[PDB]
Each structure stands twice: as C-alpha cells, then as structure tokens.
Amino acid sequence: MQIFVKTLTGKTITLEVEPSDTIENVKAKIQDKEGIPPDQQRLIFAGKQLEDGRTLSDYNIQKESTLHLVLRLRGG
Ligand SMILES: [Mg+2]
Numbered sequence: 001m002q003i004f005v006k007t008l009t010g011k012t013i014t015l016e017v018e019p020s021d022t023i024e025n026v027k028a029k030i031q032d033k034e035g036i037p038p039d040q041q042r043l044i045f046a047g048k049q050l051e052d053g054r055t056l057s058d059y060n061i062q063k064e065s066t067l068h069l070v071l072r073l074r075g076g
Contacts, residue, residue, distance in 0.1 A: 003056070004066040005030065005043070013069075019057040023050045026067075036071065044068040 005013045015029050027038035043050040045059055045067050061067070 001063040005069045007069050024052040040071050042070040
C-alpha cells in the first residue's frame, strides 16, 4: 500500500509499505530512499510519537495516511 511522509519544509515522500511493517522498517525505507539515518528520524501521527517496534496496523495507519517526519540530531 501507499503512505505519505510530510517534512517540516513541506516536501512529500511516498513509500510502499504493508500494514505489518514496523516503524523500524519504515525508517529504514526512508533511509534507503533519502539517506537519513534512522536515529535522526522521528515519525509522528494522530498525536503520537511512533515507536520502532510496533507496526503500522498498531497505529491504524492505513492506505493514503500521511505521517509527519521531524529530524533530530540528538535524543529527547
Ligand atoms: Mg493521514
């Protein structure tokens, strides 16, 4: 299925995923396609910080959903 990732500078990245992909897999796909190391990625959806070990279906992320991507240089 198709999901979208929006950045703070207003750009949209499209990903091909399955509901059983983990957030870790998604960050790895962003890194594959955009070079951003997963540790610098924060994905946000529906008022939640998303956690690497859970699945898209765990957050009811469906076809056509749009995640927010925030980059960080350190922890928090
Ligand atoms: Mg959405």
